[PDB]
Design a protein around this ligand. Structure first.
Ligand SMILES: Cc1cc(CCCCCCCOc2ccc(C3=NCCO3)cc2)on1
Ligand SMILES: Cc1cc(CCCCCCCOc2ccc(C3=NCCO3)cc2)on1
Ligand SMILES: *C(=O)CCCCCCCCCCCCC
Ligand SMILES: *C(=O)CCCCCCCCCCCCC
Lengths: 4, 266, 279, 62, 116, 279, 135, 62, 266, 4
């Protein structure tokens, strides 16, 4: 995933 | 080095050799040289026959004449070769056959003659017919053998509904099949422009939706020769020069041996 | 990265290398770039052929057929209480011409069904929502004689039960050809006449036709029993090739299609009149 | 079994690499949508089917 | 050039980018992009029409806003033949795309149709 | 963190620094804060410009068109059995004015379709649910002459089949401009008159118009065959710019729009009457 | 009444430039139309209010302050390059924000001179010369 | 391929940082919703397009 | 290697390409390729204009006809190009201009034709005049532009003292200037002998006693074409073939910009 | 998963  | 050239070629297959001092390089259709059916693409299980030198050699067909009114000539393969020596026999004694071909078209004239021939190798060359009747061209008429067929400048519909000729009516600018001739160059081809070259040489792979098929029922390749630019010489209105087609089967193999097929060509 | 080649900065020339000259008799097309005949600057090229990929060219659902079917009281004269369509891309011209840029093809096929209905007569009361059955009948299977006979039991044939008003029905089909690729063109016959044959009808076939039934048929019916008032419906079939591969390019059809084969009849004059030295 | 790939972003919002996700639900590959990531090839088998392919700066015929 | 080998000649072929008067004279055509073709053993000549445009993509239909310009051909010298030779002959023309060429927005063609 | 600047505590001044004085002839706007001319306290600022971002300003589906289409018995006089709309944000004023705060733009476009229908006449029986086809026809493609001719086969054109009663249809479109940005304003012509021209019609163009067909058309029809009784429908098209970028600000349109260009005709008096020394 | 109808010759006055008007005089002669602009001053000649034209790059020549105005313009377009003959990139508009006045002389008149320099000029697509018809 | 970001919470329930999740389903970025996380810039190219930008406490003209 | 030749050349300058399949190698005058004025040979201090691709490209002049009575043709440079596109404009808007040139002379015929053209590049080609009056040839007559001038087999003195023509009278065997034509070979040159070659190609450097000068006042190079051996074909007494001169400015730079020079050519 |  990509957590920003 | 030494002195070699694109224009000078020697082709040798079996006991036959062709030379040409005025060629325009040579074409391998779709960049694929002819080859035999691989074990992992194989479909008939029976051991094939590969006659090699006895069938894979240069058969020369009957010469045709090119004159100022000549609209174009066509042949189908393997049909043009059905009566050529042991190739013909192998083709008719077996249910299945596959073969590639080296096609060599020959037409020399002189530095003062004029004209250009479009030589085209067409996969599945389906041709248009005579009639109001669709898909009605008879087997005997679809297959002229060595003799080949011709093109016409326009569509003359076979009117006699009572006793129909069941023939093709190939119109030249439509490549005999509903498309425009100008686009036939997407097919493997060469041009014999008389100021440049004597001959055309095209090497054809076996092309089909199957690894092997019935040669008697189906033609794989069509050879179409049309005058892209008309023959002319000095001022003589009735000039005439020969066109000779010489063809060699390549990597020929056959499956399904039994009694000989005798087609009715009448 | 799928972008086309950058243009190279190219200067003046005074040399024995002559790219502008060639010989089309060879069969080859001259591989020239603008930098071979004119002075060019450096361009960093970002354009791409993404939309002209074989998949992208065919990735669109085309109308291949219009099947009409009625739901009304079963009388005793010819009626449309059920209908049958031979599966083909050839009753329509548009997709046919796109597929015909090539000799052979291999692909999976997506079928989408848009179903519309209306009332025929001014008024005999109304109708409740209809369920439509679309049965695939592969070559060999029993074909229906009646809108509700035993074949419709569909125990082994694939069938869609479409409810009217729902989103259009959609199914996918594998590559189902008998060969290693579909033949868009077949130069030959399914039978050969032999000298030893009794009649010469025995060995007669249609030129360029292969199997008699090719892919079988679709049998369409309204599953509902009839209302007092008549309802007419049409099933429009949309066909899309997917996971597409193609072989051997062909010139596009330039004159109007005349049936299933390469036959032409008329309007053999595709090109307009234009003066040689007229822009 | 999820499949994750980058999108080729055309018009960019005033906000880099953006992705999308794909999951096949059916056993038959025929059921699958199109990946549309299609590779390209040389026109050469059609534009240059010559046995002796020649360099463009040299004579076609020699 | 589909003439006899004894035939000689020099031809100018040209491309004028859009915006001015379409060339009626070699004098005007000379001023744009052009190739002076000398006839000889290499039978054929190629003129590349370079991508010169304002917009990043032109329309496939006719439209002055996305117009491509003008192609023209003229005799640089003239066709010269010897005696006993044909004084008249055909020229054939071919067209194709250079490797920087691309297309977008798929659409149905006006080149095929079907009646009711 | 997107909050605006905190107000700084500012005291009395007796100095040679004079921020209150300036010269607007320079072209610049004086960068002043309250602390430059008045005594201020310290405020920790939490307010934000989140809603005035270009995206947030346009992130709303605007009505750009109303297409009317009928389904009735095909007679032989002019009828609306199908309709065509030139794609534009200019038949409507509201979104047009918002887009026109800027000279150039670049964005993806979302199309949402709300479809409504009704019965025209008091009563000839009723109608079954209608399916609508919305076909995009890009400039160059064949335009329909008839509600059910071959063009509707839509083999290469994108088409929506909308079922009546379903949630409104929705599609997205890329940035499809021929330039690197859309031109909301074009000061120029598509053709130039040349001294060497035959008529002076040849070089005549519309001022500020670019390509003749700009983005093509939407062809709308009811796919169903006609009922006995007539049904009229309207397709309302909602347009939303997304992933928006804009260049070069412009004054907003102050007088009423008079067609596709910057032309005004009347109500050139936008401003009210107010006395100079009247609050 | 005709929309987008200003002719090329009239849209392009060259060096001479054009003018603004205090109000909209509609060209009435439907038989032989002038196909000209009708630029109304407080509407910046284009349907908007002049007071807002300050969002454009600008300077003011207020005579008590300065002799001149100097604006450096970049190439602005939706394309990297275009046809200069078909399309103008920039418009220069000069309006009297405050009217000229001197001592008590009701008929004062002073000159305005515009001097312009092209910058970083490059050209593509060479061929024969374009001769527009300006009549 | 899921994307996770913090929401700017306005009215808080009597319960800290709250998130939301986003997944693109389509290959074409045109199909995508708006991220709405948009950065801001200086008005200076419009408010101060001067070659010699001057400090507000000093004379505009000198 | 590969197949290259002295006879087959391609020249490309700006948006223009010349091909020739029958050249006789090519000449660089005095062994010097054209170049720009060096900082240490520079004389006008102002920044020069170098238009490059817009002026340094192939301008083709009006074709002349070579027949059995043709005595010779001449041109002066830059004068032949004064009206050629943006080169002409640059030449007339500036006080000073320097340029080199690629000259390509074109004349094809046939294996059965006969004749030889002497193509000569002469630095400072001063020509002789009409009269008893010395150095009297008028500017308008000294400068024919693209049209060029001609030679004569003998000296016809312009007798009309009242209204003099103020023209040159270039006699062929005297190279139009008081010397013998046989010696003109000490000048950069090529020969178009029709059995050998189609064309002549000479590359000219800027030659002068100064780094730069006024192009309007002074011609740097003269192109002289004379039939060293007369045209002949089969037995037809009235044969006629075209001669086309195509010229390209090279390394062109200009100084002294101001309002345009409009010479009076009447 | 499979990230390409
Ligand atoms: C010739 C040729 C033909 C083609 C296309 C071939 C597609 C073949 C598909 C055969 C099966 O088609 C089916 C259609 C519908 C259904 C169906 N099952 C449930 C209701 O619809 C099943 C099979 O390409 N070349
Ligand atoms: C001028 C100008 C115009 C704009 C907006 C441009 C949007 C261009 C969109 C072009 C394509 O529009 C389509 C609309 C609908 C459909 C559609 N396909 C299936 C049914 O609806 C396809 C394309 O901004 N400036
Ligand atoms: C690989 O796919 C493992 C991760 C799966 C994540 C949850 C997927 C939810 C959708 C499952 C669809 C099943 C369809 C038969
Ligand atoms: C990255 O996305 C990997 C994790 C995926 C979690 C399950 C997602 C379920 C939704 C998948 C949508 C597929 C749409 C084509």
């Amino acid at each position: 995933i990509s957590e920003v | 080095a030494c002195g070699y050239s694109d224009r000078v070629l020697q082709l040798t297959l079996g006991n036959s050799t062709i030379t040409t001092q005025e060629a325009a390089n040579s074409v391998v259709a779709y960049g694929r040289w002819p080859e035999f059916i691989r074990d992992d693409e194989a479909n008939p299980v029976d051991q094939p026959t590969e006659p090699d030198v006895a069938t894979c050699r240069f058969y020369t067909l009957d010469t045709v004449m090119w004159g100022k009114e000549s609209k174009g000539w066509w042949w189908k393969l393997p049909d043009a070769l059905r009566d050529m020596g042991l190739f013909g026999q192998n083709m008719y004694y077996h249910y299945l056959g596959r073969s590639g071909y080296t096609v060599h078209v020959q037409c020399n004239a002189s530095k003062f003659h004029q004209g250009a021939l479009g030589v085209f190798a067409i996969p599945e060359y389906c041709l248009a017919g005579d009639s109001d009747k669709q898909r009605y061209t008879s087997y005997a008429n679809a297959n002229p053998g060595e003799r080949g067929g011709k093109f016409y400048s326009q569509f003359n519909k076979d009117n006699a509904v009572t006793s129909p000729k069941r023939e093709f009516c190939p119109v030249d600018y439509l490549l005999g099949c509903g498309v425009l001739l100008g686009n036939a160059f997407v097919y493997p081809h060469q041009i014999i422009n008389l100021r440049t070259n004597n001959s055309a040489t095209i090497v054809l792979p076996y092309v089909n939706a199957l690894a092997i098929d019935s040669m008697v029922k189906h033609n794989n390749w069509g050879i179409a020769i049309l005058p892209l630019s008309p023959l002319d010489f000095a001022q003589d209105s009735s000039v005439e020069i020969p066109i000779t087609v010489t063809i060699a089967p390549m990597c020929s193999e056959f499956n399904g041996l039994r009694n000989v097929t005798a087609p009715k060509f009448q | 990265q799928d972008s086309l080649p950058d243009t190279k900065a190219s200067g003046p020339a005074h040399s024995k290398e002559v790219p502008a000259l060639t010989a089309v008799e060879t069969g080859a097309t001259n591989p020239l770039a603008p930098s071979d005949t004119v002075q060019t600057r450096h361009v960093v090229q970002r354009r791409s052929r993404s939309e002209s990929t074989i998949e992208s060219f065919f990735a669109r659902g085309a109308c291949v057929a219009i099947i009409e079917v009625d739901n009304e009281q079963p009388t005793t004269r010819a009626q449309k209480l059920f209908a049958m369509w031979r599966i083909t891309y050839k009753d329509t011209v548009q997709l046919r011409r796109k597929l015909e840029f090539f000799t052979y093809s291999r692909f999976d096929m997506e079928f989408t069904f848009v179903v519309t209905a209306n009332f025929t007569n001014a008024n005999n009361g109304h109708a409740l929502n209809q369920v439509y059955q679309i049965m695939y009948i592969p070559p060999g299977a029993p074909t229906p004689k009646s809108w509700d006979d035993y074949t419709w039991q569909t125990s082994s044939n694939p069938s869609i039960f479409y409810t009217y008003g729902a989103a259009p029905a959609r199914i996918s089909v594998p590559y189902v050809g008998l060969a290693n690729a579909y033949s868009h063109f077949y130069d030959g016959f399914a039978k050969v006449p032999l000298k030893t044959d009794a009649n010469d009808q025995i060995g007669d076939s249609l030129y360029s036709a292969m199997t008699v039934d090719d892919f079988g048929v679709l049998a369409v019916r309204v599953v509902n029993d009839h209302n007092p008032t008549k309802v007419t419906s049409k099933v429009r079939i949309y066909m899309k090739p997917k996971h597409v591969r193609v072989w051997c390019p062909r010139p596009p059809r330039a004159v109007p299609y005349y049936g299933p084969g390469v036959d032409y009849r008329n309007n053999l004059d595709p090109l307009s009149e234009k003066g040689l030295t007229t822009y | 079994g999820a499949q994750v790939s980058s999108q080729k972003v055309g018009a960019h919002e005033n906000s880099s690499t953006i992705n999308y996700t794909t999951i096949n639900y059916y056993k038959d590959s025929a059921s699958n949508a199109a990946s549309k990531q299609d590779y390209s090839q040389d026109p050469s088998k059609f534009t240059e089917p010559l046995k002796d392919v020649l360099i463009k700066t040299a004579p076609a015929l020699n | 050039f589909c003439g006899s080998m004894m035939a000689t000649g020099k031809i100018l072929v040209a491309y004028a980018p859009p915006g001015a008067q379409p060339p009626t004279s070699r004098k005007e055509a000379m001023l744009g992009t052009h190739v002076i073709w000398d006839l000889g053993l290499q039978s054929s000549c190629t003129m590349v029409v370079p991508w010169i445009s304002n917009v990043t993509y032109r329309q496939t239909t006719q439209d002055s806003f996305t117009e491509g310009g003008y192609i023209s051909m003229f005799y640089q010298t003239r066709i010269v033949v010897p005696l006993s030779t044909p004084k008249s002959m055909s020229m054939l023309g071919f067209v194709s795309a250079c490797n920087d060429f691309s297309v977008r927005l798929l659409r149905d063609t006006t080149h095929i149709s079907q009646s009711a």
